[PDB]
Design an enzyme around this catalytic site. Structure first.
Site, PDB file in Angstrom:
ATOM      1  N   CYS A 141      37.581   0.084 -35.306  1.00 20.81           N
ATOM      2  CA  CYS A 141      36.459  -0.692 -35.808  1.00 20.81           C
ATOM      3  C   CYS A 141      35.304  -0.466 -34.861  1.00 20.81           C
ATOM      4  O   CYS A 141      35.325  -0.922 -33.716  1.00 20.81           O
ATOM      5  CB  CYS A 141      36.794  -2.182 -35.880  1.00 20.81           C
ATOM      6  SG  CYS A 141      35.449  -3.147 -36.595  1.00 20.81           S
TER       7      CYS A 141
ATOM      8  N   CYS B 244      28.307   0.502 -39.561  1.00 15.61           N
ATOM      9  CA  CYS B 244      29.729   0.826 -39.452  1.00 15.61           C
ATOM     10  C   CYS B 244      29.988   2.050 -38.577  1.00 15.61           C
ATOM     11  O   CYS B 244      29.541   3.156 -38.889  1.00 15.61           O
ATOM     12  CB  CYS B 244      30.300   1.052 -40.857  1.00 15.61           C
ATOM     13  SG  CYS B 244      32.076   1.290 -40.937  1.00 15.61           S
TER      14      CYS B 244
END
Length: 318
Positions: free
Chosen positions: A90, A238
């Site tokens: 992540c 992201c």
């Protein structure tokens, strides 16, 4: 006292929230992060739900469980999760994790090794407080894959790995803006499910649970919209998604090694990307580095009462 506790520190990266759990979760053993993620999801999923779902959280929330690393020389181990399940790596979450550890006074500017369920990453905390994350290797698995999506028609894009599986849609013709979210979500959701219904997976059989769209930006190399596996969108550009994009750009000669790539998100946040070849081997996977900034936004102790029917969050049907 009697209520159970989950000690957390929240932060956000370009608006994308990360809930770092520094205490309260069950023991997950001494195995590697991938093994602890298995145990977490198989025997202790209730803790993920209590941590990030309503009423204590929301569907946008991404969680990060801090673990003692296997290699005592590494800085930390971590497991990321969202409203529907677990993640691999992540990007924004690692930036948030590093900012939180620094805020807790546990680390200072420097290079910190972090073990994750998909491999170790290297995060550099800069003097200015921002964080550069040297992600795990990224690469494009399949190119220009066409898919018949109900309600949209034929859609084609690349399937690439950047710490999670992504489907980068080419020529979606959608307006990527903060005022067009419902459309962008409906569109990507259709694609996400079509890929699932038609059994189109990653090289390892993994589900392609992230769908991202790209477009030009007047103040950045590109702007994107990223649908996460739980149908929530990423407020940030992201990191694993931008890493996947870097892998594609790199394969098509659109970006050179060492050259910067400014990625803006659907709501304006920005990450700076860069890459080098895995082991200096050109033409293969790349080692992408994503730089961004997080802000600690809260410190808290979640409380779980024995008689609270929503102690394990409000887990909705279907």
């Amino acid at each position: 006292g009697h209520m159970q506790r989950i000690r957390i520190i929240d932060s956000h990266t370009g608006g994308e929230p990360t809930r770092l759990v520094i205490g309260g979760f069950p023991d997950l053993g001494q195995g590697d992060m991938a093994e602890r993620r298995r145990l977490l999801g198989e025997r202790h999923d209730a803790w993920r739900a209590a941590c990030i779902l309503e009423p204590r959280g929301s569907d946008v929330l991404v969680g990060a469980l801090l673990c003692a690393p296997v290699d005592p020389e590494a800085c930390a181990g971590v497991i990321f999760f969202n409203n529907s399940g677990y993640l691999g790596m992540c990007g924004h979450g690692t930036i948030g994790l590093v900012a939180s550890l620094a805020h807790l006074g546990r680390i200072g500017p420097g290079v910190h090794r972090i073990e994750t369920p998909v491999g170790e990453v290297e995060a550099t905390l800069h003097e200015d407080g921002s964080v550069s994350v040297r992600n795990v290797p990224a690469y494009r698995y399949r190119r220009q894959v066409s898919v018949e999506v109900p309600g949209i028609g034929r859609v084609s894009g690349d399937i690439a790995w950047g710490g999670n599986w992504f489907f980068l849609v080419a020529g979606h013709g959608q307006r990527l803006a903060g005022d067009n979210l419902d459309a962008l979500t409906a569109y990507t959701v259709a694609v996400q499910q079509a890929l699932d219904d038609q059994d189109i997976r990653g090289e390892d059989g993994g589900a392609i649970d992230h769908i991202e769209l790209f477009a030009d930006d007047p103040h950045a190399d590109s702007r994107n919209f990223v649908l996460c596996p739980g149908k929530a969108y990423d407020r940030s550009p992201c990191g694993t998604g931008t890493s996947a994009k870097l892998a594609c750009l790199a394969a098509d000669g659109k970006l050179l090694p060492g050259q910067p790539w400014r990625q803006a998100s659907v709501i304006g946040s920005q990450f700076e990307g860069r890459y080098e070849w895995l082991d200096g081997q050109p033409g293969g996977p790349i080692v992408p580095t994503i730089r961004g900034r997080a802000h600690v936004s809260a410190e808290a102790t979640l409380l779980l009462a024995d008689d609270d029917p929503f102690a394990w969050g409000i887990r909705r049907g279907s």
